[PDB]
Design a binder for this molecule. Sequence first.
Ligand code: A1IHK
Length: 438
Amino acid sequence: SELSAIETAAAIAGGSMTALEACDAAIARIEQRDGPINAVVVRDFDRAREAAKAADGEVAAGVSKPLLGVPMTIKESIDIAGLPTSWGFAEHADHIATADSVVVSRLKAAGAVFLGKTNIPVALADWQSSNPNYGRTNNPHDLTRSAGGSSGGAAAALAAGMVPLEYGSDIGGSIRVPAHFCGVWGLKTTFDAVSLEGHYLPRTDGARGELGVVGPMARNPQDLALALDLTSRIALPIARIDTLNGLRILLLTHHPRAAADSAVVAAVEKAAESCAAQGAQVSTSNADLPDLSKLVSDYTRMLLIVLAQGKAPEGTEPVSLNAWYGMLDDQARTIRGFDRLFDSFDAIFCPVLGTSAFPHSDEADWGKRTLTIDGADTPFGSQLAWISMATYCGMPALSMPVGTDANGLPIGLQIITRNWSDHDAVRIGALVADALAA
Ligand SMILES: Nc1ccc(Cc2ccc(N)cc2)cc1
């Protein structure tokens, strides 16, 4: 493959290459590779090479920083000063951000260089990345399939080797699902651990909502861990895990509210037997597991209120504030349920989604889509079940590649750890990957 973000940084810091050559190589890969993929839909190449020269002025003057001169892109829905943030809305094509987002400001502070931004579905509301401003992003592994969404272009740029680092957002699996579909690494972070300032509905500038998070995306866990330390509000607890021996794993290949294809089950199951072969204690049932079906209903109820900003259609009565406060009480009760579960487990292993990447759908209404699972059509939206646990209850959740299905399409494993243990999620993935090579 290509240089990782850390390897790029270290090459720039040893002499092997200049930030501006690094920036020009990335530009080269994007132009040579993005034609059929359409992942880098906002390009800031001229300014990017200026800041690359600026980065080289620093290196020539003794300066070092963990990402100095490292080229990267970011999800279109995160503000970069001077660049559109439209979220795919035609009405906001020309909404130009005035201020870097906090994530961007943080990575810029660490010396990174921003070449542009990556494609998203309209309103960040799909497991595909398609919109009238930029068009559609195609899975580098099979151009007839979805790149995932809403962070789909991010994952596709990573998978195609264009840039070593990205940063996405997830309120309904939009980091994990595209990483899963495209065969790269994506970390949904603990709720409220990373600032969403600059991840603004276009032309707004308010408070972060419940549920949603931003987190990094990369080709490897080392880059994720570094990107996390550079962007979290405060420094998060370092990884306590340094071996799979004795690691306690809750393996969930069933969900009461969604099916999984047998290839996906096999992939996740194999990742767990592989860990076991290194000492892990793998369980398949526990009485402290919260009601996953009630969880899906509570999460969905709250997801639709959040996305609608508390509004309801004409004739329909909105939720009262007090009822909303009751919904947060419910959410807190469920969260305590997982606190008790993590007294007995270090991680949950489960699918990210019940299928690998599906063929492009032009059907806007999820209720009219299907997904083929084990040869039969099943409801498309049911699959939110798999990503509901970590979003609703706040936990960090890694999506990492662990296999390919029979058509060559990536399959990812979801690793859920306890709140604030984001670095243990990443570290356990790193160890799953060693174990599967063994
Ligand atoms: N038709 C329809 C129904 C439900 C949703 C919720 C949602 C789904 C996926 C993501 N990544 C974010 C939000 C979006 C569209």
